[PDB]
């Protein structure tokens, strides 16, 4: 009876247990240009 009542818990537990070219996007360029002084 104890083994049967623990089946759901076992399942949950089991689930847990188991050349660098840089293209910088415009959005980032725009940010860097706006904050260029900083």
């Amino acid at each position: 009876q104890m083994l049967k009542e623990m089946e759901k818990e076992v399942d949950v537990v089991d689930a847990v247990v188991r050349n660098a070219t840089l293209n910088i996007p415009n959005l980032l360029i725009s940010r860097i240009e706006s904050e260029m002084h900083r």
């Binding site: 083994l3 076992v10 847990v16 247990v17």
Partner: protein
Amino acid sequence: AEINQKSLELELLRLEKETADITHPLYLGQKHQALQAMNSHLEAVLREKRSLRQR
């Protein structure tokens, strides 16, 4: 004499039926299997104690 033999047989069979859940290999085998599954599960849990603790 014939009645006596059959009566004994009946008595024996009745005794066997009444104690089968704890004595017969079939029923005992099923209990073994359920116990082995849980063992394995617990072994696994103990093996991953660190990760589980961190989580």
